[PDB]
Ligand binder design. Structure first.
Ligand SMILES: *[C@@H]1O[C@H](CO[C@@H]2O[C@@H](C)[C@@H](O)[C@@H](O)[C@@H]2O)[C@@H](O[C@@H]2O[C@H](CO)[C@@H](O)[C@H](O)[C@H]2NC(C)=O)[C@H](O)[C@H]1NC(C)=O
Ligand SMILES: *[C@@H]1O[C@H](CO[C@@H]2O[C@@H](C)[C@@H](O)[C@@H](O)[C@@H]2O)[C@@H](O[C@@H]2O[C@H](CO)[C@@H](O)[C@H](O)[C@H]2NC(C)=O)[C@H](O)[C@H]1NC(C)=O
Ligand SMILES: NC(=O)c1cc[n+](COC[n+]2ccccc2/C=N/O)cc1
Ligand SMILES: NC(=O)c1cc[n+](COC[n+]2ccccc2/C=N/O)cc1
Ligand SMILES: *[C@@H]1O[C@H](CO)[C@@H](O)[C@H](O)[C@H]1NC(C)=O
Lengths: 530, 533
């Protein structure tokens, strides 16, 4: 019997499992209950701490995936299936995972806590691409990841009501962070060195924990990959949250908030999922029905206002983007786009694309977008149009919100490091024109190329190892840099320096699309106001 | 008496003078009356045709400059003085000039007619830089230029009134064009081949003759240099014209505001010209560079709609047009009020001074619109670099007032029938007295067009004499054929799509694309949607 796989946490005893890597074994504890199952009368409610159990919880395999839409755009395509549930769906899904060196550390080891993305409507901690074994073995941290409720189960809100208060998916994450504070030491982890990292809606979630005081005591550093709490998709106002909740009820045959939530609670989970997308105000890409709501509780103001007001002295943050943030999203409803052709679009398609990738803004606003992003010497060239619509979607949704966050944090006391991830994986199954798409730096950060059963090059493995070193350096010290040999300088509102991450050594550059982001961050708000 | 210097025109007999040029003799008839002096009761009225006369009028020197403000910014400085009146000021100023080859052409010769600029508040056909003797000698065209009233005398308008209808300085120009039709043949010119060219407000004036049906019949081709009738400074609406006219009258004691129009104008007419001039700049809405008190008014008469609308709505088949700009249209205007600018230093302005300049150079737009200008013209990787800020403010002023209005005119005309040729003038004259940072400023292509470097009293290089002869050749080629190309690299037409134009400098023609295309999309496409909403 292996005593390295036996662990007692406050609620009871756990039996973990030993995992293999090309670098030696790792201890893993998968499927640890951290909340009471949020089912029946507990749907839409805040998570309750998991009650103590007797006997041994079997933590040798991943647990169920929180109920969510399953992507059917390209059935069986690698590039989409890698994000789909790889366990059975269930509302009984609040479990977290711990990987730790083997044998377990006997001195406090810094903790990395992963929060998955998926637009707040999808995702799981069990995806192959989130496999913690390579990071833990290589950089000897403790790694934790949790499932949190998504879609209406996590974010349906009738503001004011006790029955559906909103943001419970965010509370799921906070409970898991509390859990870590109370129990990570039993695994060799150091609760005083906890670094949050997340991608897309996971990065948005990380920033929201930054801006919400009751979370802020639960971690010490923060990594934001390709997402930001101020992104225009990441939050919704109270009024609009009430309208969307109300339309879901009508769509599934339900009628006073108490009566409304009660009837919603009688419906099978799959029925809510089936209808969730039909509550969005217009046709779009990059917009999601149930998201964090600004209501004074979890978020006392908008993430924007909160970022501007904050004193961020003492904070170290790592943030960045992939080279082509917008391309992936275009195949989900921009006229003329497909992964299976060159997507060489017409000016009229571009024009229609813009109202899809920049939803719910005025005509005048859309015109301003077309002005900035048209090359008026080549207004109708298909290739340039495809690239320009990709820039529109990427800039609006990811790059410029991340740029705004980095500038305001650095200017208000934080130490910020910025990257652009520019390496196209040799194994990438999306077409060439998509470039380096959204989400394809994750497999490198988690060191998936080290898996021999996969087909990365020798150079991609050396690359993964570099990235894993930067990230773990940052978690340990607040500074990704390796000792002087080329150095990764802090990002500042003035010099705006960041580094390129690819097979070549670090290259220092200026401006996260500064010209484009002045448009979105400086001009466009003035316009919508006045 | 010498036969070549005697001509009979419909009004009576004229006597002229023989001019010496480097390349040989020219006949000039300077200071020909074409209107009754718009004096006393005739102030603010349309010009009356000059009554016939007996005996011989001596047309042997330039007549007086129309009453106008005289620039005092840099007194004695060449760069400003070259534009100031070089004859006495008078309201008696409605004379024109004809230069012709010596001896007088045997067969009908193409006519170039010149319309000076000066913001509609200044200018004169007698300026040295408009000396027609070199063009006529080199290219054997007939050259005509006229004086027309400026400032309040030309453009004060109380719309609807009989006593001050407005646009009379444009009517002065039309009368001169009518004069050319009826008389140019007596000088050996061809009234069926008449090409208007003007610079700045003269180019705006040329464009307005295009868009006013009674003018349009008096010429066949058009050349617009650094100016366009759709420029934001070039016209005013009826209500604002009246407001300005009314404020002017008030500021000089008329009446002892508004009231009967006839009484107000009669009181205006009793004021000395110099008094009107002294007060004319106090009627502008805000302080600005590039805005002028009395300019053409859109009132349904001379102009039946705004120049924009008329341009958009027009059929221009059978028309050839040559248009262009200088390399640095805006720089000249900045030393007249933009904070931090002077000809006598580097004008390395601050960010605060740049922002403040955007309001002066783009006057009377909302804060939202100003914000949008700052967005487009700031380099956000270098938001505070003084040199860059200087250059950008020059671009702002240049693009808004000259380049994008011309670009818009060029594109619509191409699209709607006309053959268009476009240039950018890029040579900085060896004699230029303005500082190096101003580059190639507004108006400094003119002296090459008129072949002034051939003047032996001036100290131009030999290459500049060659270059000036090239330019003269293009303009006259265009006037003869509607095509500036030698009937050497070719000058292609301008089109809304390929947007091709040539650079004019000491090097041979180079073909390039887009007249500040990115910048002008902002001014010509987006910004007007902002003003609606
Ligand atoms: C590139 O593909 C898009 C997407 O169309 C889909 O994928 C193709 C590979 C093919 O299998 C189509 O049948 C699919 O519908 C094309 O845009 C579509 O054009 C068809 C024309 O009948 C239209 O009915 C669809 O609505 C369009 N889809 C979208 C999303 O706009 C596009 O035409 C292709 N480019 C080409 C052919 O040059
Ligand atoms: C560059 O010059 C401007 C213009 O000022 C005049 O021209 C100078 C060459 C010199 O002769 C000055 O003495 C003149 O007054 C300067 O802007 C002026 O600055 C003064 C204060 O020092 C102020 O009172 C004026 O209003 C300013 N005028 C404008 C149009 O802004 C400018 O500061 C000079 N830049 C330098 C010297 O670096
Ligand atoms: N009917 C539904 O519940 C539903 C839910 C989610 N989506 C989103 O699927 C597309 N998508 C899938 C993966 C990543 C991004 C995107 C882009 N969305 O805009 C569609 C329908
Ligand atoms: N009548 C007036 O008071 C007056 C004052 C100022 N201005 C314009 O100021 C000079 N200026 C300003 C901008 C460009 C050129 C010039 C040169 N003028 O001759 C005109 C009239
Ligand atoms: C203005 O005064 C004149 C002069 O007596 C007179 O005809 C009338 O009162 C007014 N004229 C017009 C046209 O209104």
């Amino acid at each position: 019997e292996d005593a390295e796989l036996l662990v007692t946490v406050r609620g009871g005893r756990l039996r973990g499992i030993r995992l293999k890597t090309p670098g030696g074994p790792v201890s893993a504890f998968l499927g640890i209950p951290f909340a009471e199952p949020p089912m029946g009368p507990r749907r839409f409610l805040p998570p309750e701490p998991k009650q103590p159990w007797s006997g041994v919880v079997d933590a040798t395999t991943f647990q169920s995936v929180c109920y969510q839409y399953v992507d059917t755009l390209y059935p069986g395509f690698e590039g989409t299936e890698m994000w789909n549930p790889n366990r059975e769906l269930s509302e009984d899904c609040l479990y977290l995972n711990v990987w730790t060196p083997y044998p377990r550390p006997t001195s406090p080891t810094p903790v990395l806590v992963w929060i998955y993305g998926g637009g707040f409507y999808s995702g799981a901690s069990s995806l192959d691409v989130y496999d913690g074994r390579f990071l833990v073995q290589a950089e000897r941290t403790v790694l934790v990841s949790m499932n949190y409720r998504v879609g209406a189960f996590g974010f349906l809100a009738l503001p004011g009501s006790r029955e559906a208060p909103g943001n419970v998916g965010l509370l799921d994450q906070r409970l898991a962070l509390q859990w870590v504070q109370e129990n990570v030491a039993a695994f060799g982890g150091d609760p005083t060195s906890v670094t949050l990292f997340g991608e897309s809606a996971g990065a948005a979630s990380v920033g929201m924990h930054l801006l919400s005081p009751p979370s802020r005591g639960l971690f010490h550093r923060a990594v934001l990959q390709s997402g930001a709490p101020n992104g225009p998709w990441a939050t919704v106002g109270m009024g609009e949250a009430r309208r969307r909740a109300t339309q879901l009820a009508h769509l599934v045959g339900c009628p006073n908030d108490t009566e409304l939530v009660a009837c919603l609670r009688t419906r099978p989970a799959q029925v809510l999922v089936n209808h969730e997308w039909h509550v969005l105000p217009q046709e779009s890409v990059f917009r999601f029905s149930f998201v964090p709501v600004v209501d004074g509780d979890f978020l006392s103001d908008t993430p924007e206002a909160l970022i501007n007001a904050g004193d961020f002295h003492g904070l170290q943050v790592l943030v960045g983007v992939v080279k082509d943030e917008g391309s992936y999203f275009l195949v989900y409803g921009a006229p003329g786009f497909s992964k299976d052709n060159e997507s060489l679009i017409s000016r009229a398609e571009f024009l229609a694309g813009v109202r899809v990738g920049v939803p719910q803004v005025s005509d005048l606003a859309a015109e301003a977008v077309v002005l900035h992003y048209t090359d008026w010497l080549h207004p109708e060239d298909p290739a340039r149009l495809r690239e320009a619509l990709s820039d529109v979607v990427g800039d609006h949704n990811v790059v410029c919100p991340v740029a705004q966050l980095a500038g305001r944090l650095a200017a208000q006391g934080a130490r910020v490091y910025a990257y652009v991830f520019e390496h196209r994986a040799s194994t990438l199954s999306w077409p060439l024109w998509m470039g380096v798409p959204h989400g394809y730096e994750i497999e490198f950060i988690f060191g998936i190329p080290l898996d021999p059963s996969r087909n990365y090059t020798a150079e991609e493995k050396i690359f993964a190892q570099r990235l894993m070193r930067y990230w773990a350096n940052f978690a340990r010290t607040g500074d990704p840099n390796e000792p002087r040999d080329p150095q990764w300088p802090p990002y500042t509102a003035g010099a705006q320096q960041y580094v390129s991450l690819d097979l070549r050594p670090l290259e220092v550059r200026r401006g996260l699309r500064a010209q484009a982001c002045a448009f979105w961050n400086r001009f466009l708000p003035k316009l919508l106001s006045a």
